[PDB]
Design a protein around this ligand. Structure first.
Ligand SMILES: CCCCCCCCCCCCO[C@@H]1O[C@H](CO)[C@@H](O[C@H]2O[C@H](CO)[C@@H](O)[C@H](O)[C@H]2O)[C@H](O)[C@H]1O
Ligand SMILES: CCCCCCCCCCCCO[C@@H]1O[C@H](CO)[C@@H](O[C@H]2O[C@H](CO)[C@@H](O)[C@H](O)[C@H]2O)[C@H](O)[C@H]1O
Ligand SMILES: CCCCCCCCCCCCO[C@@H]1O[C@H](CO)[C@@H](O[C@H]2O[C@H](CO)[C@@H](O)[C@H](O)[C@H]2O)[C@H](O)[C@H]1O
Ligand SMILES: CCCCCCCCCCCC
Ligand SMILES: CCCCCCCCCC
Ligand SMILES: CCCCCCCC
Ligand SMILES: CCCCCCCC
Ligand SMILES: CCCCCC
Lengths: 240, 49, 179
């Protein structure tokens, strides 16, 4: 039940971050509706395959939220950028948008299954544990693509606000106007920096190797265990 | 589909290669025998007087 | 037990290979996939740092959370080089220009997702009470991984890309051409 609470809480927090960026109740709602739709469907798939609701399937759900919300965001954000880059209306924009990412969403789900499936194949007792996650996360991702191909486009096209060519929320007054201005600015600052780094380089491959060796260092030092001991509110005392 | 892959030979190879290693991995784990189970099963009751 | 141990190397080995093959199909290239796969370490480092820091262990929860972090940063990198590549291919944009326009179109979506998810797992790293051992273990790995993945990727992926596009090209630019 505590994991369930975190799920709900996580969806609330997602709603808040969406708002910070989308700044419109109806828009933020899209990525927000998508999560529970996919999660609920995932339980149905778990039933279909004879899995139970357990600690591992539940954490699979939690971890899945990162993947799910990104699917919705990629879809919703890309449309936005389009309505900003062109002033094309909502229905026409999601079409052109979906036209240009939809291929990628599907391909990505494929490469991702390549990272989560292999773990369904661990051997022994170990294996049954990792398998709970693998199947939960893969199923959720598959459903997420489905939802991104069916629900999200429909939702963008009917619930999104027309953005006018060139508008970026700077016209707004109060926090958003301020936020939107800082980001637009900080963005030019981002590109300015990359533009610099791309004239350099060599040095950054060297920094990259630092990070790799460091990573390797920490890895071999981090002790390995299996599953944590939890305080389950009971215990026994043996007398011999 | 052929027209699709005629222009995407790498995509074509990828599919072939994935199939091959799925099969290579299968070979490492497949049981070996002369025959699968072909005799019908039997149950025996034994008693003594 | 004997029985035997460590299947990890072999299975993530094939995982890497399949990921490479999938990406090669996606990009119709044997070289470009490296520009995505090189992001993998960038999330791991933060995960290891945060776990080393809280005194955690390399356990089930650490591993799955890492795959998730890796998945996401992979996805981010894929959509970045997809955009650059298309720009260079559909439009005639030259290498650097396309990389910069790609990277700039992708900043926001990347940030929206990173923040939504790092906050989303906060309740987990902060957890006390029933099952907080599991909750803490899940959350902190992800949080650290996502932080480093996010900050490190938005600078490094553009690097991976141009460095890979050069090394594995064939005298035909890197202007700028069209169409
Ligand atoms: C944002 C959406 C996605 C997240 C949602 C995930 C929720 C996870 C739920 C896990 C724990 C639920 O556990 C389950 O709950 C229901 C709730 O009554 C129980 O079901 C029981 O209650 C109801 C009546 O009130 C009856 O319909 C049912 O006959 C009875 O068995 C189950 O017997 C129990 O096993
Ligand atoms: C039989 C067992 C094994 C099954 C095979 C494994 C499949 C692995 C595939 C993973 C990636 C597939 O991803 C797919 O790639 C092609 C080719 O670039 C894309 O196709 C799209 O992009 C390319 C290039 O930008 C265009 O030329 C193409 O016209 C367009 O439709 C798809 O939009 C994408 O979804
Ligand atoms: C490119 C996409 C994918 C890239 C792959 C990234 C994944 C990186 C982290 C994977 C986990 C590595 O961590 C490794 O896990 C195995 C078990 O699972 C551990 O294995 C050890 O502990 C377990 C305990 O259950 C024993 O069964 C095992 O025999 C023993 O050697 C290793 O001590 C550890 O080093
Ligand atoms: C002319 C095209 C040559 C393509 C080479 C691809 C070879 C892949 C072989 C993989 C074997 C497992
Ligand atoms: C022009 C129709 C393209 C058909 C493509 C078929 C794709 C098969 C992927 C396995
Ligand atoms: C997995 C190694 C692939 C090597 C690709 C090299 C392409 C030139
Ligand atoms: C798994 C082997 C892939 C090799 C591809 C080489 C392309 C030139
Ligand atoms: C493993 C930490 C135990 C505390 C959980 C209540």
């Amino acid at each position: 039940h505590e994991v369930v609470k975190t799920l709900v809480e996580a969806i609330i927090l997602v709603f808040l971050v969406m708002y910070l960026f989308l700044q419109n109740f109806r828009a933020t709602l899209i990525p927000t509706i998508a999560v529970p739709v996919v999660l609920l469907g995932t339980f149905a798939v778990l039933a279909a395959f004879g899995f139970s609701i357990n600690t591992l399937t539940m954490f699979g759900m939690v971890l899945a939220i990162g993947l799910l919300v990104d699917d919705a965001i990629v879809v919703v954000e890309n449309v936005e950028r389009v309505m900003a880059e062109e002033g094309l209306p909502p229905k026409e924009a999601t079409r052109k948008s979906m036209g240009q990412i939809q291929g990628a969403l599907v391909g990505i789900a494929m490469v991702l299954s390549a990272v989560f499936v292999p773990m369904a194949f661990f051997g022994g007792s170990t294996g049954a544990i990792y398998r709970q996650f693998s199947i939960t996360i893969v199923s959720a991702m598959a459903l997420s693509v489905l939802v991104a191909l069916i629900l999200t486009p429909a939702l963008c096209a009917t619930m999104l606000k027309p953005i006018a060519k060139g508008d970026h929320g700077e016209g707004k007054k109060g926090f958003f106007g301020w936020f939107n201005r800082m980001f637009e600015k900080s963005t030019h600052h981002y590109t300015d920096s990359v533009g610099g780094i791309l004239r350099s380089t060599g040095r950054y491959l060297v920094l990259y190797l630092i990070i790799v060796v460091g990573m390797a260092y920490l890895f071999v030092r981090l002790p390995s265990s299996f599953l944590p001991d939890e305080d389950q509110g009971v215990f026994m005392t043996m007398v011999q | 589909m052929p027209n699709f892959f005629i222009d995407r030979p790498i995509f074509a190879w990828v599919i072939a290669i994935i199939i091959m290693l799925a099969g290579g991995l299968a070979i490492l784990k497949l049981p070996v025998a002369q025959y699968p189970t072909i005799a019908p099963p039997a149950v025996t009751i034994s008693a003594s007087y | 037990e004997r029985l035997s141990g460590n299947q990890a190397p072999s299975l993530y080995a094939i995982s890497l290979i399949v990921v490479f093959l999938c990406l090669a199909a996606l990009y119709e290239s044997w070289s470009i996939p490296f520009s995505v796969m090189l992001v993998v370490p960038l999330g791991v480092i933060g995960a290891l740092l945060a776990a080393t820091f809280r005194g955690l262990t390399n356990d089930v929860y650490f591993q799955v959370g890492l795959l998730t972090t890796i998945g996401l940063s992979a996805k981010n990198a894929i959509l970045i080089v997809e955009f650059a590549k298309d720009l260079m291919d559909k439009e005639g944009k030259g290498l650097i220009e396309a990389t910069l326009d790609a990277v700039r179109m992708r900043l926001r979506p990347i940030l929206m997702t990173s923040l939504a998810f790092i906050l989303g797992v906060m309740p987990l790293v902060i957890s006390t009470g029933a099952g907080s051992g599991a909750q803490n273990a899940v959350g902190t790995g992800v949080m650290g991984g996502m932080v480093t993945a996010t900050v490190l990727a938005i600078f490094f992926v553009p690097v991976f890309f141009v460095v890979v596009r050069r090394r594995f090209s064939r005298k035909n630019e890197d202007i700028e051409h069209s169409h």
